[PDB]
Amino acid sequence: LACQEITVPLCKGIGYQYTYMPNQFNHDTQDEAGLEVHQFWPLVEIQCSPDLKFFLCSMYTPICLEDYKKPLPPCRSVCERAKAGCAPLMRQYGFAWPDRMRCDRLPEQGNPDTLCMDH
Amino acid sequence: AREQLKEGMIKIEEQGKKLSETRTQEELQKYVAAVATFALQAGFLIGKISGEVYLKLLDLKKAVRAKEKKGLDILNMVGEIKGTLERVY
Incomplete structure (x- = not known):
């Protein structure tokens, strides 16, 4: 994993400063990942969920740590809370919860075998 | 007379x-x-216009945070004025 400073404006100041590429969506540069994640800016600025910005960024700009050389996904609870807040508002504007953001794919909190980020 | 200052002081x-x-x-x-x-x-969820608006909103947010920073410097200055004014009494 090669760490690179996060340059995506939406993902700055989220709790960590370094990310790696490619992400799970096979984006090769932050410019490519940035262009997609920025489309979600109205949902972030409307504040349907306090957890939305961290959840989105934790996938498009996954955290990179010099000591922990392993992908660290968001805890499932982070995804579920973001879905609870924003999915109804998205649904009201004709958009379903994106398939790449399905919460079942993420590890649960407190599992001794796999670590995840929760706040 | 010296007690008028304290009345003026609180007004300051x-x-x-x-x-x-x-x-x-x-x-x-x-x-x-x-x-x-x-x-x-x-x-917006045309696509190019949406990206510019968000970039403007972040600069606006920076401007607001900048305006708030100077307000704090003002508050720092009003404190220092109260300090030296108190030194005479």
């Missing part, structure tokens, strides 16, 4: 309190939400 302290008005953070959040609502109804 009272007026100094009003000087660092700030209060912009509450109004800013409503404005950004209003733009986000418009953005949603316009269907």
